[PDB]
Design a protein around this ligand. Structure first.
Ligand code: ATP
Ligand code: ATP
Ligand code: ATP
Lengths: 86, 230, 251, 69, 248, 137, 292, 229, 146
């Protein structure tokens, strides 16, 4: 989990983000991934930081980055839409 | 506790093992059955595999009622079982109704029984089509079942080797109106049509159904008739 | 001797004199198939024919034909049959036909269709348009059941002759051919071996005499004692435990 | 020079004699197929004008089917 | 290792066996029921028209089930014969319950549940048989229904059989009659349906079947009609073919 | 797999099914069983001589006898018609096997005289198998 | 099939080249001959004896065989677990028996490019008929000895060409007793029955598991040259081992070298042997879920 | 279908600018799928013989593992033919997927002599790789059914015309006896009928020769006692 | 393929050179590379993995709001009796491509201009869409959906 938090630190410091956010929630959101895919997450939060005019990346830019890459980019854009659990 | 069928449809929709059971029937033997105007004549040609076998032991022509004769299409060890079933079923009709059962009732009931045996799978379906006859209420009748639970009705009907050849030979040779000895005449004519040359009193074996009732003939009178029946 | 004499009749006669066939007029036959248990000396009998005619022997192990290509197998078949068309008194021998003969089932596979086409190179090219002239075909297999019934019609191969397990003068006389170069004495109870044997081929009597001699090497008996032969019977009749499915009866 | 043919396909018709001869004056029982092949090969090859006064066709291919033997 | 599927979905969202049952349906003979207010008819096709038979059965597709209700059939025969024995057991059971005949729909829904129990479980082959329903009641009069292997049932006015009857249904949408309960309009109409869609040359009577079911004075009689009026329906319908070729 | 070879279907189509019109009279193809073709061979139009060739029968069977037994020496008076009056089904090529087993059986005796044992032993070397008769159903 | 010198002009066969060296084979000839005396083979000493009586004495004295007058042996099969030691007869008979040690492997008979199985085999043994006609070590013969099939779109019909060409060129065709076939298969059940019969490989020499003291013994062979503290009881070690082959005796002993190498000890320690005894619990995992 | 041929071909032959005066594009090929050419070899050959340059039937599938891709990778050699012989019409019957894709590389809107007329024809199931089976790739898609008794009657007039004829014949009976050919069962009935008049010394060819010819051509139904369904 | 050596070990080497040269070394900098397929299954995932290929963009078939502009602009250059409604064509076919819009919007002009009519009736759109779309799996065979 925490090597992934370390890579969150690596690709977090290497770009313009906001230093008021967390990453353990994202390491929970990443079960099985490479740090290159973590970099794809960080660049995708960069893409939401392009859409809105953002240079201090919020938590939600990473939230939509992971919900993009792992969920809305797994096969199509729909792995969920059933509750049944919660 | 298996058997939640065994039979699936083909991707064509057909049922393969039933067709292989029909292959097991048609790859067997040729015999003959002819309905005449008065009774129904059934005939086999039972030659032994060796020169040793007693022909007084096993008998292909078998009555179920005193006015109902029957033969089959396949193997004896199945045939004795389903015969025993049909015997007991006819006894059930006679216990209910105290009256000799019409043949079509055995057609519906026994054909439904064999249809049940096609249904499930832990068992094979019986590779037998039946040749049923009985002189019930003035009219004699001749009914041809299948392994697959259905049935038919013929003026004459054969099965097995050269079945289209013997069948067309009945279509050419026989007609609507004959007699009993005429039916035995064209029955031997279609019997030796594809049988071997050695056909004695003990090879052929005939059972008839007069309106007076079933009569399993003996090799005495078979030797009296089939000693050059033309 | 029935196989020697009658197989001698179907093989040796139309090269010694094919004109007695022509005094009759009728064409001589073509070939046959030997069967029975494996290793009973089908190859050894073929080597006896190889000693008898001494002329034109083309003997193929007949499973090294399919390398990984399709018609390469056929092209080797055509080349061998053209060489057989070249030389007049050619003799063919083939063994383990089941890896190259096979059986045609419904086509759902992808590697013995090659054996079907190659098998059809046999179906045509044992007959062809031109018949083979003085080109005999000696066939030997272990299971003659799984071969094609299209092959099993006569004319191509005339007859399927059975080779059995060795009888007691086969065990004995073949054993005494194997008891030749042996530094024995007046000790050799052969029926200790043979009656303690239960059917053993010529190479199994190589096993009996050879490993009995290996027990003669045990404690370095430079002579040959009889009791080592019974030891060889113990070892080999003990070693028959791993072998089953003793027969294949064709057709 | 120009040579319009080239060597062969594979075997090229055997060219002389290897024709095994037993079909016209000698054959055991194929009168339907001998009769029809005769009708469909030999009578086309000479009587082309019988394909004219009735005006029928040239012949084409054919198939046989029979067990091995 | 021996379960074929017997009770399973496609890995997507459909069903395996029922499709192939419908593949077994369309390769059969063809029946039809017509729009008639005063009774209702059915037309059927004699499979196995070989000549050496007996034909002493007086019905092959028709099964007059209770008193005033019958049914055609299409599919495996004796399975459906079990369904007729069971069906007459159920409606006749209902009659034993009430001394009143069935209202003719809940019987059909019951049989759809019977096939349906084989669709969900049972580890077996369901019935690939679709069949017809005719009758009369106190609440809708003469009725027309269609069975399915899916456990569905259709409340019809003009029914459908498989590939031999798809163009028939296109004809019935093309030749929809309405208001006319005159049975002979449906007789020449159905003689046109089997005249085209069946490949029987000139519509031989021994390849076809017609049976009606008409209200008669409190009896609701069923006419398993003979063949001579079928012959004059053939001559009448080919006379209508002469009327069709008047325009040349 | 080897669908590339499966070039053969489009080969026989593209080269045969489509007409030459003037050349190659009657390519002849032959084998008992046909699960092979027919839309491409026995066709509307194509069938100019594309004719199925079924089996022979009797009334020439003793002429198979008559022709092939002229090869051997025939002794003097051992007759031949005596054996086809019966179900034999001994497909042409096999009467030659009867003549080779029978005649060469007399060559085991080295006698060109042919007698009825050559008939009977060539009913005991040939098609006698399978099951001569089952003869029921 | 020879390299010859030919004139560019007259096209005359001028000289024979002394450069027919044969790629891979002449490289397959082990020229180093590493030493292995029979002190290393612990636990298979009866197999040493039947080994020598089977193999070493046909190299020395065929008069021991043919004054008695039968035959020499033909091929010996070595099998068992793959840590019991099949290299030990190869290097032991290499160094100890003074003959040209030739080796051969299993996958050294499979090249993508095909056309015959009769060049590397036939020029390998026909190579070895002169400069190595006494010792040939086939290794992993079970990798190519595959039980044949009658099936489609699966399996190999090749290999066996190399192996029946091995038997073919070697035996029967001028049968000379100038060759010793040594094969060490890990398993036997994949091999054909036509490869083991009576003269293909005459013997079936199985190698059982090192019971206790061949584990401590061969483990001590690994710890012979390493600096070992005398606080080591090999019977404690190999006794608390269960189901180890000498691949795992070696694995535990070298892993005692590496676990002893982690902290930087001056010598091997018995704890580091005991740590090797459980080199990461074989398959590790260790979830104590459900076992409580 | 011939009128559809007039649409797909002849208006881009005769008046392409009167069609493009509207401002839309042209269809290219009909995909004549049915019994092995059903009015197809002599049909599209006989008709498009009469366009005087504009039909170069390269036939496009003959040595298919050699005419396609072997030597002509980007089979566009054919397309250089069809451009530099701008009155032309191309016909065809893993490489097939490749060359398919280069067809789609040219004919998806990137085209010199406008549409040519590329045509493929096969039969019985169209389960080739469906990246061709987009309709924007093949516009016209025409099944070939069995012709009707009117059309079987007309072809019966066509190939019955050139024979030695006997007066007093009904052809509607014979076309009625047809189950529906692929074009010319007519021709087989004519050839077997005249063959019946040939083996026999006959120079009048009555309808009986034709009916025995039908009986030779059309046969084979059997095997009762399987009347399930 | 035909013009080829050993198949499994030819394009493995070329696509291997693509894997090395495409997105291995030789500093990308600013070199845009866009590739396109229709299916996905034969793709070796060694290029699908990130670093090499970053975005994988699918394409759906268009919805009815976007259909009206394609139907309209494909009909923007033709004389048309505008009393007919395109919304039947926009609603009816559920999984059209734009080539279906193209083929119908040309085909109806083939049916009106088939009879020299400059403007198009609705039944020419009926014959147009029934001419373009074929083998509509609705009833017949099974049509279990009803
Ligand atoms: N009938 C026999 N007469 C003389 N020797 C025999 C006989 N049968 C077997 N042998 C001896 O057996 C040995 C092997 O014979 P052979 O090679 O024919 O076995 P095989 O029959 O080919 O076995 P397989 O075909 O199962 O491998 C030969 O050396 C031969 O001397
Ligand atoms: N239904 C039809 N309509 C018009 N012409 C037809 C029809 N059927 C056949 N023809 C005529 O028959 C001739 C040959 O047709 P075609 O080439 O399709 O035969 P085919 O069906 O391909 O036969 P096969 O596939 O058996 O070779 C054509 O010239 C054509 O004019
Ligand atoms: N305005 C539009 N809205 C939606 N779809 C459109 C529009 N215009 C065109 N299209 C669709 O997009 C496609 C554009 O051509 P395209 O390159 O996709 O064809 P293609 O070469 O067959 O593609 P491929 O080779 O990838 O299958 C057309 O087939 C059309 O259906």
């Amino acid at each position: 989990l925490e090597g992934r938090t370390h890579i969150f630190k690596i690709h977090a410091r290497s770009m313009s983000v906001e230093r008021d956010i967390r990453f353990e929630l994202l390491a929970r959101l990443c079960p099985n991934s490479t740090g290159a895919e973590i970099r794809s997450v960080c660049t995708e939060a960069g893409m939401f930081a392009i859409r809105a005019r953002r240079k201090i990346a919020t938590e939600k830019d990473f939230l939509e980055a992971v919900n993009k890459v792992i969920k809305s980019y797994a096969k199509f854009s729909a792995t969920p839409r059933y509750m049944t659990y919660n | 506790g298996y058997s939640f069928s065994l039979t699936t449809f083909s991707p064509s929709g057909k049922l393969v093992q039933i067709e292989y059971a029909l292959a097991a029937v048609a790859g067997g033997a040729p015999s003959v059955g002819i309905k005449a105007a008065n009774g129904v004549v059934l005939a086999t040609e039972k030659k032994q595999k060796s020169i040793l076998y007693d022909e007084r032991s096993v008998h292909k022509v078998e009555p179920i009622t005193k006015h109902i004769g029957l033969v089959y299409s396949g193997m004896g060890p199945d045939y004795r079982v389903l015969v025993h079933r049909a015997r007991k079923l006819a006894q059930q009709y006679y216990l209910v109704y105290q009256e000799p059962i019409p043949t079509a009732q055995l057609v519906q009931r026994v054909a439904s029984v064999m249809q049940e045996y096609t249904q499930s799978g832990g068992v094979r379906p019986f590779g037998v089509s039946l040749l049923i006859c009985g002189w019930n209420e003035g009219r004699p009748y001749l009914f041809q079942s299948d392994p697959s639970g259905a049935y038919f009705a013929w003026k004459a009907t054969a099965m097995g080797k050269n079945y289209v050849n013997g069948k067309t030979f009945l279509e050419k040779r026989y007609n609507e109106d004959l007699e009993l000895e005429d039916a035995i005449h064209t029955a031997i004519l279609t019997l030796k049509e594809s049988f071997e040359g050695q056909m004695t009193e003990d090879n052929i074996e005939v059972g008839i159904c007069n309106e007076a009732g079933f009569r399993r003939l003996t090799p005495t009178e078979v030797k009296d008739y089939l000693a050059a029946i033309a | 001797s029935e196989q020697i004499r009658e197989l001698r009749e179907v093989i040796e006669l139309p090269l010694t004199n094919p004109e007695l066939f022509q005094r009759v007029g009728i064409i001589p036959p073509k070939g046959c198939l030997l069967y029975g248990p494996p290793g009973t000396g089908k190859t050894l009998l073929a080597r006896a024919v190889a000693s008898q005619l001494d002329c034109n022997f083309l003997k193929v192990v007949s499973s090294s034909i399919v390398d990984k290509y399709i018609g390469e197998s056929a092209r080797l078949i055509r080349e061998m049959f053209n060489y057989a068309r070249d030389h007049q008194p050619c003799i063919i021998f083939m063994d383990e036909i089941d890896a190259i003969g096979g059986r045609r089932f419904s086509e759902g596979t992808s590697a013995d269709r090659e054996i079907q086409r190659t098998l059809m190179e046999l179906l045509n090219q044992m007959d062809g348009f031109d018949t083979l002239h003085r080109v005999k075909m000696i066939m030997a297999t272990n299971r003659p059941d799984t071969l094609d019934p299209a092959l099993l019609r006569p004319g191509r191969l005339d007859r399927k002759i059975h080779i059995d397990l060795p009888n007691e003068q086969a065990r004995l006389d073949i054993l005494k051919i194997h008891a030749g170069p042996i530094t024995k004495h007046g000790e050799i109870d052969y029926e200790a071996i043979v009656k303690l044997s239960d059917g053993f081929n010529g190479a199994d009597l190589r096993n009996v005499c050879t490993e009995a001699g290996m027990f003669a090497i045990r404690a370095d008996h430079d002579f040959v004692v009889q009791e080592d032969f019974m030891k060889a019977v113990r070892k080999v009749a003990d070693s028959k435990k791993l072998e089953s499915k003793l027969d294949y009866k064709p057709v | 020079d120009v040579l319009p043919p080239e060597a062969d396909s594979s075997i090229m018709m055997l060219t002389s004699d290897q024709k095994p001869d037993v079909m016209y004056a000698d054959i055991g029982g194929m009168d339907i197929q001998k009769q029809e092949v005769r009708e469909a090969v030999e009578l086309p090859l000479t009587h082309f004008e019988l394909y004219k006064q009735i005006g029928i066709d040239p012949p084409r291919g054919v198939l046989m089917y029979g067990p091995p033997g | 290792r021996y379960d074929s599927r017997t009770t399973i979905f496609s890995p997507e969202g459909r069903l395996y066996q029922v499709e192939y049952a419908m593949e077994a349906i369309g390769h059969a003979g063809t029946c039809l029921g017509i729009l008639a207010n005063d009774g209702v008819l059915l037309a059927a096709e004699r499979r196995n028209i070989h000549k050496l038979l007996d034909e002493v059965f007086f019905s092959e597709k028709i099964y007059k089930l209770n008193e005033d209700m019958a049914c055609s059939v299409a599919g495996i025969t004796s399975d459906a014969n079990v369904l007729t024995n069971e069906l007459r057991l159920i409606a006749q059971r209902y009659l034993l319950q009430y001394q009143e005949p069935i209202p003719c729909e809940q019987l059909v829904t019951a049989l759809c549940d019977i096939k349906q129990a084989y669709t969900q479980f049972g580890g077996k082959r369901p019935f690939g048989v679709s069949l017809l329903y005719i009758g009369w009641d106190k609440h809708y009069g003469f009725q027309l229904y269609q069975s399915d292997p899916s456990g569905n049932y259709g409340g019809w006015k003009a029914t459908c059989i498989g590939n031999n009857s798809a163009a028939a249904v296109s004809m019935l949408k093309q030749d929809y009659k309405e208001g006319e309960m005159t049975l002979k309009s449906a007789l020449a109409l159905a003689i046109k349906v089997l005249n085209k869609t069946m490949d029987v040359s000139k519509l031989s009577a021994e390849k076809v079947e017609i049976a009606t079911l008409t209200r008669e004075n409190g009896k609701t009689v069923i006419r398993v009609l003979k063949q001579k009026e079928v012959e004059q329906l053939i001559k009448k319908h080919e006379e209508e073919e002469a009327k069709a070729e008047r325009e040349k | 797999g080897a669908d590339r070879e499966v070039r053969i279907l489009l080969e026989l189509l593209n080269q045969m099914d489509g007409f030459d019109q003037n050349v190659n009279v009657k390519v002849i193809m032959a084998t008992n069983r046909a699960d092979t073709l027919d839309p491409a061979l026995l066709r509307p139009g194509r069938l100019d001589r594309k004719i199925e060739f079924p089996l022979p029968d009797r009334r020439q069977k003793r002429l198979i006898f008559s022709t092939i037994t002229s090869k051997m020496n025939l002794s003097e008076e051992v007759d031949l018609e005596d054996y086809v009056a019966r179900p034999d089904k001994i497909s042409g090529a096999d009467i030659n096997s009867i003549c080779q087993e029978s005649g060469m059986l007399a060559v085991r005796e080295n006698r060109y005289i042919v007698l009825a044992k050559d008939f009977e032993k060539a009913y005991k070397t040939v098609i006698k198998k399978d099951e001569q008769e089952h003869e029921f159903y | 099939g020879d390299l010859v010198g030919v004139n560019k002009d007259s096209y005359l066969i001028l000289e024979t080249l002394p450069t027919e060296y044969d790629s891979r084979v002449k490289a397959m000839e082990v020229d180093e001959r590493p030493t292995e005396q029979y002190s290393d083979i612990g636990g298979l000493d009866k197999q040493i004896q039947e080994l020598v009586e089977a193999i070493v004495l046909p190299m020395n004295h065929k008069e021991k065989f043919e004054n008695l007058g039968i035959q020499p042996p033909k091929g010996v099969l070595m099998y068992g677990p793959p840590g019991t030691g099949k290299t030990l007869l190869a290097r032991a008979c290499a160094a100890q028996t003074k003959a040209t040690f030739l080796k051969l492997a299993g996958p050294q008979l499979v090249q993508m490019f095909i056309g015959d199985g009769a060049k590397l085999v036939r020029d390998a043994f026909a190579l070895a008929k002169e400069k190595a006609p006494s010792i040939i070590f086939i290794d992993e013969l079970d990798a190519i000895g595959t039980k044949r099939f009658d099936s489609e779109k699966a399996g190999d019909r090749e290999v066996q060409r190399t192996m029946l060409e091995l038997l073919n060129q070697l035996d029967g065709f001028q049968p000379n007793t100038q060759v010793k076939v040594i094969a060490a298969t890990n398993r036997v059940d994949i091999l054909d029955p036509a490869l083991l019969r009576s003269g293909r490989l005459d013997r079936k020499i199985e190698f059982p598991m090192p019971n206790e003291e061949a584990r401590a013994r061969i483990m001590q062979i690994h710890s012979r040259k390493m600096n070992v503290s005398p606080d080591v009881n090999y019977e404690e070690l190999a006794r608390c081992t269960d189901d180890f082959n000498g691949a795992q005796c070696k694995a535990v002993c070298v892993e005692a070298g590496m676990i002893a190498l982690r902290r930087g000890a001056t010598e091997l320690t018995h704890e580091d042997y005991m740590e090797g005894i459980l080199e990461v619990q074989a398959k590790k995992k260790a979830n104590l879920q459900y076992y409580a | 279908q011939i009128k559809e041929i007039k649409e797909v071909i002849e208006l881009p032959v005769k008046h392409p600018e009167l069609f493009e005066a509207l401002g839309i594009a042209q269809p290219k090929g009909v995909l004549l799928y049915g019994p092995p050419g059903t009015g197809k070899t002599l049909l599209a050959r006989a008709v498009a013989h009469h366009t005087d340059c504009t039909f170069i039937r390269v036939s496009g599938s003959e040595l298919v593992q050699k005419f396609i891709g072997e030597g002509a990778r980007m089979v566009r050699e054919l397309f250089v033919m069809a451009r530099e012989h701008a009155p032309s019409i191309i016909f065809m019957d893993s490489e097939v997927q490749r060359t398919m894709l280069e067809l789609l590389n040219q004919l998806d809107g990137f085209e010199a002599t406008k549409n040519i007329k590329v045509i493929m024809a096969t039969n019985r199931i169209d389960i080739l790789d469906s990246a061709l089976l987009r309709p924007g790739r093949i516009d016209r898609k025409i099944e070939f059914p069995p012709p009707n008794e009117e059309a079987r009657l007309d072809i019966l007039k066509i190939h019955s015309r050139k024979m030695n004829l006997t007066r007093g014949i009904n052809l509607r009976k014979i076309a009625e006896l047809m189950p529906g050919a692929s074009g010319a069962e007519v021709k087989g009935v004519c050839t077997e009928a005249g063959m019946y008049a040939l083996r026999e010394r006959r120079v009048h060819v009555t309808q009986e020769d034709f009916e025995m010819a039908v009986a030779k051509v059309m046969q084979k139904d059997s095997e009762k006692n399987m009347s399930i369904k | 393929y035909d013009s080829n050596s050993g198949g499994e070990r030819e394009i493995q080497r070329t696509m291997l050179e693509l894997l090395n040269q495409l997105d291995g070394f030789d500093s990308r900098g600013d070199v845009k590379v866009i590739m396109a397929t229709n299916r996905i299954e034969t793709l070796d995932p060694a290029l699908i993995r990130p670093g090499r290929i970053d975005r994988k963009i699918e394409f759906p078939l268009p919805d009815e709001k976007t259909k009206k502009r394609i139907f309209q602009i494909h009909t923007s250059r033709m004389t048309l009796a505008d009393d007919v409604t395109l919304d039947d064509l926009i609603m009816a076919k559920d999984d059209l491509s734009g080539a279906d819009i193209k083929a119908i919007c040309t085909e109806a002009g083939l049916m009106a201009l088939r009879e020299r009519r400059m403007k198009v009736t609705n039944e020419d759109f009926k014959k147009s869409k029934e001419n373009v779309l074929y083998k509509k799996q609705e009833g017949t065979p099974e049509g279990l959906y009803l």
